[PDB]
Amino acid sequence: SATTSLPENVIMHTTLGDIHMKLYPEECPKTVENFTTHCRNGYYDNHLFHRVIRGFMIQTGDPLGDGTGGQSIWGREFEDEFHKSLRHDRPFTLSMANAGPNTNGSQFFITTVATPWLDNKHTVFGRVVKGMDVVQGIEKVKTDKNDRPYQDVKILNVTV
Amino acid sequence: SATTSLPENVIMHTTLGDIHMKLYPEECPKTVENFTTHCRNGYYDNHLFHRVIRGFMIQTGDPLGDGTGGQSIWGREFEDEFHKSLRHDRPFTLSMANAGPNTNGSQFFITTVATPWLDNKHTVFGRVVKGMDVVQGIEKVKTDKNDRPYQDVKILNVTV
Numbered sequence: 001s002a003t004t005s006l007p008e009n010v011i012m013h014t015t016l017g018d019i020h021m022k023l024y025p026e027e028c029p030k031t032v033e034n035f036t037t038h039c040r041n042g043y044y045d046n047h048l049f050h051r052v053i054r055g056f057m058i059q060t061g062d063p064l065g066d067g068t069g070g071q072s073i074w075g076r077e078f079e080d081e082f083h084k085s086l087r088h089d090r091p092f093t094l095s096m097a098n099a100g101p102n103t104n105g106s107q108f109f110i111t112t113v114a115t116p117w118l119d120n121k122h123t124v125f126g127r128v129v130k131g132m133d134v135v136q137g138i139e140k141v142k143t144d145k146n147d148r149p150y151q152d153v154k155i156l157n158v159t160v
Numbered sequence: 161s162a163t164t165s166l167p168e169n170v171i172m173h174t175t176l177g178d179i180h181m182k183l184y185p186e187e188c189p190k191t192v193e194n195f196t197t198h199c200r201n202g203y204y205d206n207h208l209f210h211r212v213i214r215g216f217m218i219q220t221g222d223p224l225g226d227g228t229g230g231q232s233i234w235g236r237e238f239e240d241e242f243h244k245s246l247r248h249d250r251p252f253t254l255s256m257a258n259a260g261p262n263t264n265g266s267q268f269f270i271t272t273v274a275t276p277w278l279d280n281k282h283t284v285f286g287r288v289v290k291g292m293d294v295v296q297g298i299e300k301v302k303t304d305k306n307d308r309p310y311q312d313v314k315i316l317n318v319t320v
C-alpha cells in the first residue's frame with residue numbers, strides 16, 4: 001500500500017508527430033502500470049501502427065507488427081478494468097486491444113471517433129490531449145486491403 | 161553523376177520535443193550524406209546530448225555518450241566542407257564537432273547563439289527552422305562540472 005504514484009501523462013513520438021495523452025491510473029491501475037512500464041523500458045520503440053482504419057481508430061503496440069504478438073509486463077495476459085465513468089464516448093480515447101475478455105497484452109489503439117460498441121469490451125485508460133491532428137494524420141494514410149499502411153508509421157518512443 | 165537527391169530536411173525527436181532542421185547538401189554533400197544516412201539507419205537513436213553549455217551550444221551524436229566515440233558512414237573520419245556562405249552567424253546553426261581539421265565522424269552540435277570563432281573550423285551544414293524553443297529548453301538543463309546533464313536528454317529518432 002505504500003508505493004509510488006503511477007505516471008498520468010505520456011508523450012508518444014511518432015513518424016508523423018507527437019501525441020500527448022493523459023491516463024487514468026486511479027480507475028485502471030493495472031492497465032496504466034503495464035502501459036507506462038512498457039513505455040519507460042522502450043518496449044514500444046519502433047512499433048508499427050500496423051492496423052489503421054480511417055473513421056475508426058489506429059492500432060499499435062505489437063512487437064511483431066501484425067496483431068499476433070506482444071505481452072504484458074507480467075508475461076501473462078491480464079484483466080480488463082472497466083468503469084462506467086470511462087467510455088469510448090468521444091474521439092481520441094486510448095484503449096486496450098484484445099481477443100476477448102481478460103486477454104490484455106501490450107497492443108493498444110486510439111480512436112478517431114466515438115466507438116460506443118467497444119464499451120465494456122476494451123479497457124479505456126486514457127485520452128489524447130494534444131496532437132489530435134497527428135492522430136488524424138496517421139488515420140488518413142493509404143493502406144492495403146488488410147488496413148496496413150503502405151509506408152510504415154512508427155512509434156519512435158513514448159516518454160514518461 | 162546520375163544519383164539520388166540528398167534529403168534537405170529532418171525532424172529530430174528528443175526527450176524535450178522536436179527540432180526541425182534544414183540542411184545544405186549542395187554546399188556540404190559529404191556531411192549531409194553522412195548525417196542523413198546515419199539518421200535513416202537509426203544510428204543516432206537514443207544518443208545523449210552529452211555536452212550542454214548554456215549560452216553556447218548542445219552537442220550529441222556519440223554512441224558512447226561522452227565525446228570519445230562515433231564514426232562516419234565510411235568507417236573513417238572525413239573532410240571538412242567549409243564555405244564562405246555558411247557561417248556560425250546566427251543562433252541555432254547545425255555543425256560537426258571534431259578534433260581538428262578533417263576529423264569528422266558522427267558527433268554534431270547546435271548553437272544557441274552566433275559562434276563566429278568556429279567559422280572555418282567546423283562544417284556548418286544546416287540550421288534549425290522549427291523547435292528553436294526546444295533547443296533552448298535543452299540548453300538550460302542542470303549540468304555537472306563537465307557540462308553533462310544530470311537528467312539524460314536523448315535523441316529518440318531523426319526522421320528523413
Ligand SMILES: [Co+2]
Pocket residue numbers: 012013014017018172173174177178
Ligand atoms: Co517528437
Ligand SMILES: [Co+2]
Pocket residue numbers: 130131132133134
Ligand atoms: Co492537435
Ligand SMILES: [Co+2]
Pocket residue numbers: 197198201203233
Ligand atoms: Co549508419
